[PDB]
């Protein structure tokens, strides 16, 4: 039962790893085409709710989007 | 399209947020086993393989696996 549980951590690391590379690939394309417009970025707006719902994790989860916002450039 | 860039944005977010909540459950469901046996945290060990696969973002990667450890108690 706990190696069970963690192959299932392993399984959810493969997945969140995945999906994180990915963020940050999706997050430079944006940040890439809005400094070719020269706009201004959306750090109290936007950013600000990527925060708030991470946020629902407790303290570490602000902390997480934070990571993830600097992870896309 | 950086509309539909920040429409995948929201989706990532909404599986990563998914996983890590779950990873959470799984870690605690983990620890309170081990702490039934009074078993040694396997830090050197496993959180440190942990680490070593999120250490390919970078840094951040780095931190990263130490949030995901911190919230999973």
Same mark, same amino acid.
């Given at each position: /039962?706990?190696?069970? $549980?963690?192959? /299932?951590?392993?399984?959810?690391?493969?997945? !969140?790893?995945?999906?994180?590379?990915?963020?940050?690939?999706?997050s @430079?394309?944006?940040? @890439?085409?809005?400094?070719?417009?020269?706009?201004?970025?959306?750090?109290?707006?936007?950013?600000?709710?990527? !925060?708030?719902?991470?946020? /629902? $994790?407790?303290?570490?989860? @602000?902390?997480?989007? !934070? $990571?993830?916002?600097? $992870?896309?450039?």
């Amino acid at each position: /039962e706990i190696d069970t $549980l963690r192959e /299932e951590i392993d399984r959810l690391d493969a997945e !969140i790893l995945a999906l994180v590379k990915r963020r940050a690939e999706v997050s @430079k394309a944006i940040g @890439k085409a809005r400094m070719a417009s020269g706009g201004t970025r959306l750090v109290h707006s936007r950013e600000m709710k990527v !925060i708030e719902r991470y946020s /629902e $994790l407790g303290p570490d989860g @602000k902390d997480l989007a !934070i $990571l993830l916002l600097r $992870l896309g450039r």
